[PDB]
């Protein structure tokens, strides 16, 4: 940092990435794949 | 003087005894309504004139008007490299007191090779006088309305736009406000939404400090430069010098030097640098031999007598010493090697005197045929060629910023400051940066602290024995946010 | 990835202490002890490196 050699912060803080991953997990467990095409449709887990 | 009288344009360059209040006075006669130039009180005398020029005759009005300002003139005056540059333009306008806002170009009009020094100037007006101006020259006069504005130039950097015909219609000042720096960077009068990088702001150091130990002794040069006697070149003499100031600007009152040259160091800086382990060599040679004292040379002196290392940083001084070392019979005290089996090494001295075997038939100390004595006597007399006369030659060699030293030359030390980006010299080491107290623990035999970055980061102050940490100033970076030119300027 | 990054930065930084054919590898060692005319050649060599 003391020669004109700078590092820069990423755009997303790690909490944001954590939120994204949590959202994906929730989507898969509670809606199968159906959230990846349109509105999130619920369905029990045994039938998924 | 630049003047535009009623008929001609006159450009004079002379020494004038100018009046305190020079001007022009035009009298208006009521009987015949006309304005005629009568008074021109400019200078008392004009002694020596160098350049002159007069333009063609012409006629203007010179009548007093009562309407509004209808002529705007702009002029720019430069003096660069002995050239007086006058750029001009004029425009019809209606504004009387306001200064108009417009974008007009100034076309070059006249350039002259004057080559003089101008540091002040004075404007020159006219006067109007009539029966309504009663009194003498000093009071019997009116003024008449006119106005002007003056401003100063400055070295800057602009961006200019050229239209199809070739005219400058617009420009942007690269250093006015950040949006302008952005337009300057992208080379476009339009900038679209986003972020940009322009430059880097650097904190600037204000003060400077010098930290030097105490030296009072003066160097033993009167027994090096004023030495009653000098030795033979082959047994060249050497001397160690320490703990003194080397005032080489006092090299001139007592004597003057045939040759005074320095390699790897510029002479002017010798006072500001702390040297290490001064060695002073001394000998006497022939003038012809004076061209052998240089790195990468040949000749018997340069081969069998004296040699310099290739990376010899230091100074060569030598002055002719004919009068002291010329004897009418011949100064034979000076002897030199001519024969040697091999070349000598730099900073080596050999005093062997053995019968040189030129070829076969080993001499066995006979000095017979093909057997010669390596040492030969210089014969110096007042009546000899300049290239043969004796010369006293001295070499100064030394180290720089590679070890604790004591020869610093003449300088002055000052106080100490903290926590402010400054500049510093520390026993000849240089640099800029905030100086805070250190928590390191130097051992009592070392004077620095180094990093992976390979730059110093601590220093032991040569006075207080204290340990100071250098922290560089925060250069950082500058970025700018804009919502586009079209939408806004903020 | 992290190892490669760190290695590259350390090499780029350590490369500041070589002569590249000059008398010294510090521009402050060349601001002094020289005048412009004969300093500029060694400043040139450092620039190239
Ligand atoms: C203007 O100056 C020129 C050059 O000195 C001179 O010949 C001419 O007579 C002058 N005219 C007036 C009206 O002063
Ligand atoms: C300048 O003026 C002085 C006094 O009139 C004169 O002696 C001298 O020769 C002049 N020099 C030139 C170059 O005209
Ligand atoms: C020009 O004259 C001014 C005032 O005497 C002086 O300060 C300045 O150094 C001069 N410059 C030159 C180049 O003669
Ligand atoms: C160029 O000059 C012509 C004639 O005055 C004018 O009609 C035209 O508008 C000018 N064009 C530009 C780009 O200034
Ligand atoms: C040499 O001698 C002169 C007077 O004889 C003296 O003033 C001077 O300081 C001396 N200089 C050196 C370099 O010995
Ligand atoms: C120099 O002299 C000062 C007092 O003038 C003294 O305090 C100091 O110890 C001396 N030595 C150094 C290296 O400053």
UniProtKB/Swiss-Prot annotation, chain A:
Could you tell me the superkingdom of the organism this chain comes from?
Answer: Viruses
* Resulting phenotype, residue 35 to L: In strain: Eta/B.1.525
Summarizing the annotation, the consequence of altering residue 6 to N is: In strain: Lambda/C.37
Functionally, this protein is described as follows: Subunit of the fusion protein that is processed upon entry into the host cell. Mediates fusion of the virion and cellular membranes by functioning as a class I viral fusion protein. Contains a viral fusion peptide that is unmasked after S2 cleavage. This cleavage can occur at the cell membrane by host TMPRSS2 or during endocytosis by host CSTL. In either case, this triggers an extensive and irreversible conformational change that leads to fusion of the viral envelope with the cellular cytoplasmic membrane, releasing viral genomic RNA into the host cell cytoplasm.
**UniProt protein name:** Spike protein S2'
Name of the gene this protein is made from: S
Of the intact sequence, the residues represented are 854 to 901 of 1273
């Amino acid at each position: 940092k003391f020669n004109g050699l700078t590092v820069l912060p990423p755009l997303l803080t790690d909490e944001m990435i954590a939120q994204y991953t949590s959202a994906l997990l929730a989507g898969t467990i509670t809606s199968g794949w159906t959230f990846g095409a349109g509105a999130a449709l619920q369905i029990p887990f045994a039938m998924q | 003087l630049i003047v535009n009288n009623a008929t001609n344009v006159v450009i004079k360059v002379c020494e004038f005894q100018f009046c305190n209040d020079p001007f022009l006075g035009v009298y208006y006669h009521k009987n015949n309504k006309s304005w005629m130039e009568s008074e021109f009180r400019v200078y008392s005398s004009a002694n020596n004139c160098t350049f002159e020029y007069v333009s063609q005759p012409f006629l203007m009005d010179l009548e007093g008007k009562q309407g509004n300002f209808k002529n705007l003139r702009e002029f720019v005056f430069k003096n660069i490299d002995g050239y007086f540059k006058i750029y001009s333009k004029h425009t019809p306008i209606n504004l009387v007191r306001d200064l108009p806002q417009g974008f007009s170009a100034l076309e070059p009009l006249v350039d002259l090779p004057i080559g003089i020094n101008i540091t002040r100037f004075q404007t020159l007006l006219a006067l109007h006088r009539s029966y309504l101006t009663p009194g003498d020259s000093s009071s019997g006069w009116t003024a008449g309305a006119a106005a002007y504005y003056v401003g100063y130039l400055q070295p800057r950097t602009f961006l200019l736009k050229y239209n199809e015909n070739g005219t400058i219609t617009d420009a942007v000042d690269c250093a006015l406000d950040p949006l302008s720096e952005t337009k300057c960077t992208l080379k476009s009068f339009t900038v679209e939404k986003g972020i940009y990088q322009t430059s880097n702001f650097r904190v600037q150091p204000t003060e400077s400090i010098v930290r030097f130990p105490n030296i009072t002794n003066l160097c033993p040069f009167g027994e090096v430069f004023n030495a009653t006697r000098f030795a033979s070149v082959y047994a060249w003499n050497r001397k160690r010098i320490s703990n003194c100031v080397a005032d080489y600007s006092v090299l001139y009152n007592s004597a003057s030097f045939s040759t005074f040259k320095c390699y790897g160091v510029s002479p002017t800086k010798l006072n500001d640098l702390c040297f290490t382990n001064v060695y002073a060599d001394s000998f006497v040679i022939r003038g012809d031999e004076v061209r052998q004292i240089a790195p990468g040379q040949t000749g018997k002196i340069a081969d069998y007598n004296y040699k310099l290392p290739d990376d010899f940083t230091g100074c060569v001084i030598a002055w002719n010493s004919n009068n002291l070392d010329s004897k009418v019979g011949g100064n034979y005290n000076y002897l030199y090697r001519l024969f040697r089996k091999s070349n000598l090494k730099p900073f080596e001295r050999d005093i062997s005197t053995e019968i040189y075997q030129a070829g076969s038939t080993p001499c066995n100390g006979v000095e017979g045929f093909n057997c010669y004595f390596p040492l030969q006597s210089y014969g110096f007399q007042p009546t000899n060629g300049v290239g043969y006369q004796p010369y006293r030659v001295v070499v100064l060699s030394f180290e720089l910023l590679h070890a604790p030293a004591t020869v610093c030359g003449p300088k002055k030390s000052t106080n100490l400051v903290k926590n402010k980006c400054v500049n510093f010299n520390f026993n000849g080491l240089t640099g800029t940066g905030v100086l805070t107290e250190s928590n390191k623990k130097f051992l009592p035999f070392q004077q620095f602290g180094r990093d992976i970055a390979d730059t110093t980061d601590a220093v032991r102050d040569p006075q207080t024995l204290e340990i100071l940490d250098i922290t560089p100033c925060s250069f950082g970076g500058v970025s700018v946010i804009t919502p586009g030119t079209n939408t806004s300027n903020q | 990835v992290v190892n490669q990054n760190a290695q590259a930065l350390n090499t780029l930084v350590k490369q500041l202490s070589s002569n590249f054919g000059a008398i010294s590898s510090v521009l402050n060692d060349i601001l002094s002890r020289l005048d412009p005319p004969e300093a500029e050649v060694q400043i040139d060599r450092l620039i190239t490196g």
